[PDB]
Ligand binder design. Structure first.
Ligand SMILES: CC(C)(COP(=O)(O)OP(=O)(O)OC[C@H]1O[C@@H](n2cnc3c(N)ncnc32)[C@H](O)[C@@H]1OP(=O)(O)O)[C@@H](O)C(=O)NCCC(=O)NCCS
Ligand SMILES: CC(C)(COP(=O)(O)OP(=O)(O)OC[C@H]1O[C@@H](n2cnc3c(N)ncnc32)[C@H](O)[C@@H]1OP(=O)(O)O)[C@@H](O)C(=O)NCCC(=O)NCCS
Lengths: 368, 370
């Protein structure tokens, strides 16, 4: 059975505290005159439950690429040149720490699964990561582009079958990275979905190692991947929409996504399995996390890891479910819990994104 | 063990005969005064070993989207809107014929793998296919974007482990589509990679069904997927390069790619496996790759027949091309009274390749027919 053997994360060094973003955003986009809009955007940042976000896109980067800060202006080439370089670099930072934890040589990896929705190139970010890390030429790459916030979960789904069907030697590095360079947009009166995305999206990278049939002398599972299944919510394609354009990516976030996602993953939870199991839910917004608490009647401690990653990092998209998994098993160990899943045995991870698409991973903890 | 249970293909109705393409291409781009450049382009087309290509991008579509035919003009938005709609539509045409040949209900599928380097969107082409085909919501989707001409083989590699690890009723639809709307560019005398790609790149869709441990009464494999491995060619990053830009995709094609590829897959054959006693499916990158296979392995001329055929009748369609060849090989083997689906031979190999340079090697096993 496939297991997660290591986790590690990385973030761009610059921190943006949510308190100061509504002024920073409207200032660098020369938009201070949209005061009524800014008041609305201040209202979104405060309700976001996000304390701080790490971002590559600093005021300097915008000055260097001034069209990114100018709505509808062509900025795709500029965004593209940044992301094609920087996405694999941030992925290398996290992958190195994850391989340090695994404690095995690079030449032991057989596969690489790279996921991002921040830039596209041929050869793609999976290749570039393998170059700058000097991976052997026998490492088999799978590139997951533009799958949004369920990419981290979908990587595990793919990794389970690769790891289990090829046997003991198969070892998979998974790397998910996002830079909101891809979709930063200046605020506008008619396009009210920016204010949502610009309040929540942030940058980060997470890496993980997956294998089955372990060398019990060197390798130790953190979690076991029991099952992994994707489902699609009918007639909801208008929920999350990403249009990649000459102005960069135009995202569109429907008001109904949190209730639609919330009702559906709460259903997946029942169909698949409530304070006796551990939970990793992609921090799409605070309302999805509350609905899990309200409809399953969870203690405040059940969603703690997911609220924590949201608060300290915001909505990093793809890699976010791995941040939460790392955060869960870390505090489990520091607090001396019974298991990597906060002392519990069974758990569930949910990724979700455009479609609407839900990726459900059934996990099992490891005794600590 | 995973097996290919059905294969089918589709292409745009408009046919562009290579003999006429230099005139067409320089006329619709209003570049016919670049007479020396056009002569060079004629020589490329005349050596392409491509007889005809099917293409979505007609003179009318250029007229409707004039920036596509103006070099460096902003046309990404125009290209995107075409491909986001037209890529799943053309994939649908192939997929339905593949399901028809399979003989099982569309609802019996469990997985969909969609591959294209022609447009990006969220939700992606895999979702849009599922929508317009009415695939049930339990069909689990994987989207392979921007992986170039090895995506068809990479889909078989991932589908092998999905079918065999889950097995049972697991059934994977693979759909690979390219439209050269993505990378069509007007000619320039400083940018001679464009002349190469404009002489060879074409449109098509292919669909295949994959499953392990199927029912003999209803389902019969065409090929068994014995193994599949991806390898990378070191220090070859600049061979095949695709820069997605506001002007569309700018590709760059090193002149040595066919030799690097040809020498690499000849070596892969030897490490992996009478070379005339196995069958071959080689991505039609150009004529030099196939001749290198024949030369360095001492192949009779029947061995690359199917790959030459697809190159001739369809050009370089990218990702789906190996499935076109696999289908052609299987069909003619049946029609011409051969003993197995691989031209009467037992073992075979499929090579896809693309940016990296990356090589996807799929070891195949024919099934007895006739
Ligand atoms: C931004 C957010 C935190 C605001 O908190 P909230 O729970 O909506 O609380 P409120 O209803 O009081 O705030 C909504 C305000 O922002 C606007 N707004 C919120 N969501 C919006 C959306 N999808 N589209 C357009 N406007 C939106 C509303 O128009 C409203 O404006 P108002 O102050 O004039 O009334 C919340 O909307 C959110 O988290 N959205 C993200 C949804 C999500 O998880 N998507 C998944 C992507 S991975
Ligand atoms: C275009 C092609 C059909 C003709 O090449 P050929 O059969 O080897 O014969 P030639 O070398 O005489 O080519 C004729 C012209 O094309 C030019 N040319 C060939 N490859 C070129 C390249 N990468 N870049 C720029 N020019 C090139 C030559 O300079 C020559 O110009 P000239 O006639 O004025 O001297 C052949 O180059 C080809 O198929 N290349 C494919 C590359 C490839 O497979 N890429 C993989 C993507 S899947």
């Amino acid at each position: 059975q496939a297991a997660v053997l290591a986790i590690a994360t990385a973030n761009p060094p610059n921190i943006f505290y949510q308190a100061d973003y509504p002024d920073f955003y409207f200032r660098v986009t020369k938009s201070e005159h949209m005061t009524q809009l800014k008041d609305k955007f201040k209202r979104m940042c405060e309700k976001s439950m996000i304390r701080k976000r790490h971002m590559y896109l600093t005021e300097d980067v915008i000055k260097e690429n001034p069209n990114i800060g100018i709505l509808n202006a062509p900025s795709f080439n500029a965004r593209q040149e940044i992301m094609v370089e920087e996405v694999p670099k941030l992925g290398k930072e996290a992958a190195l720490k994850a391989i340090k934890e695994w404690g095995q040589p690079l030449s032991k990896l057989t596969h690489l699964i790279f996921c991002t929705s921040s830039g596209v190139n041929m050869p793609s970010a999976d290749y570039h990561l393998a170059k700058i890390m000097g991976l052997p030429p026998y490492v088999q790459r799978t590139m997951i582009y533009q799958q949004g916030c369920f990419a981290g979960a979908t990587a595990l789904r793919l990794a389970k079958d690769i790891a289990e069907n090829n046997g003991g030697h198969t070892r998979i590095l998974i790397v998910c990275v996002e830079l909101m360079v891809v979709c930063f947009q200046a605020p506008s009166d008619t396009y009210l979905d920016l204010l949502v995305g610009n309040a929540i999206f942030s940058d980060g990278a997470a890496a993980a190692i997956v294998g089955a049939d372990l060398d019990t002398t060197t390798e130790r599972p953190i979690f076991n991947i029991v099952s992994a299944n994707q489902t699609t919510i009918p007639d909801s394609e208008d929920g999350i929409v990403g249009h990649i354009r000459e102005m960069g990516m135009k995202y569109y976030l429907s008001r109904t996504v949190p209730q639609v996602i919330g009702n559906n993953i709460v259903q997946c939870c029942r169909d698949t399995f409530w304070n006796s199991m551990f939970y990793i839910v992609h921090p799409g917004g605070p309302a999805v996390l509350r609905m899990m608490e309200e409809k399953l009647g969870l203690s405040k401690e059940r969603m703690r890891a997911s609220w924590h990653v949201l608060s300290e990092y915001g909505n990093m998209g793809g890699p976010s479910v791995l941040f939460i998994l790392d955060e869960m098993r870390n505090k489990s160990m520091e607090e001396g819990k019974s298991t990597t899943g906060e002392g519990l045995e069974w758990g569930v991870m949910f990724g979700f994104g455009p479609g609407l698409t839900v990726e459900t991973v059934v996990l099992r903890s490891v005794a600590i």
